[PDB]
Ligand binder design. Structure first.
Ligand SMILES: [Fe+2]
Ligand SMILES: [Fe+2]
Ligand SMILES: [Fe+2]
Ligand SMILES: [Fe+2]
Ligand SMILES: [Fe+2]
Ligand SMILES: [Fe+2]
Lengths: 170, 170
């Protein structure tokens, strides 16, 4: 596990940079598919996986990967920070500054992170007893990221989208 | 497109935080699968897609998404920054500090980013003339992120993993 302060800081910066490159590449893949370039989309999705590999390597060098219950707890802490601190503040600043698209994107994320934090708390209670959770399907809204388990709502309560547009993970 | 300086800075921070949450959840899904929690792994992958929606929404509110050739150009400039500036300095700092694990993760990423820069350069030449690239498959080394289009060596030239272990996008 890396211990020296400067190299630790640089691998945390590199983990952010790799995670952003991967994310930009998944967003560009979808745009290339929409524009009629399916092979460039394939190239972006494949290079996004290579950046997952680099990010995972820095993450494990920093000692941040544990077992499932401890990884759930990292998710609980992150999501609870976003719910209680980061997105309420960014949303209020965007409203104060009149930036309506940012009010919308922070509101979309904040309503979904409240659900994420509770789903991870429920999962950790099972994994702490050595049990997997009992969920068949997870539905995610492609507009806002609202998240629901086992049945999609008739429409998304955050953006209005109909049940039929949810993306299903089974 | 967001224009006020503080809201833009907060949506850039939120894009990085969403990107890192998505990356953590992909890393945790693989670990949950390894440990015998398939339904928790499914939950982490579905929530990772929700954080891709959140990140994409902030990135579009920032005005950073364009057409395919301009997205490839963002890719060329980001890869070239990692190749010429960021990873050579982080790898020399880790060497100077004795942090062998960080020398390794930065060396793995730098050798792959040299390839990703040239692949995006070749793809943008095509996309600028309205052509897709012609590729059948892309191979990614799951240890180091070495990347090869259509033909790959029998062993990764960076870490020596056998081609049977490469992840294939086709
Ligand atoms: Fe990378
Ligand atoms: Fe979340
Ligand atoms: Fe929605
Ligand atoms: Fe999120
Ligand atoms: Fe790269
Ligand atoms: Fe490799």
């Amino acid at each position: 596990v890396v211990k020296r302060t400067m190299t630790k800081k640089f691998l945390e910066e590199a983990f952010a940079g790799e995670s952003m490159a991967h994310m930009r590449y998944l967003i560009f893949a979808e745009k290339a598919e929409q524009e009629g370039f399916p092979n460039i989309a394939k190239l972006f999705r494949a290079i996004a996986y290579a950046e997952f590999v680099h990010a995972k390597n820095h993450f494990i060098a920093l000692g941040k990967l544990g077992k499932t219950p401890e990884n759930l707890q990292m998710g609980i802490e992150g999501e609870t920070f976003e719910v209680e601190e980061m997105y309420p503040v960014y949303n209020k600043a965007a409203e104060f500054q009149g930036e309506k698209e940012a009010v919308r994107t922070t509101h979309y994320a904040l309503e979904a992170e409240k659900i994420h934090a509770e789903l991870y708390r429920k999962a950790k209670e099972k994994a702490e007893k050595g049990e997997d959770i009992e969920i068949k399907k997870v539905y995610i809204c492609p507009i806002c990221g609202y998240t629901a388990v086992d049945e999609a709502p008739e429409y998304c309560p955050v953006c209005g989208a109909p049940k039929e547009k949810f993306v299903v993970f089974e």
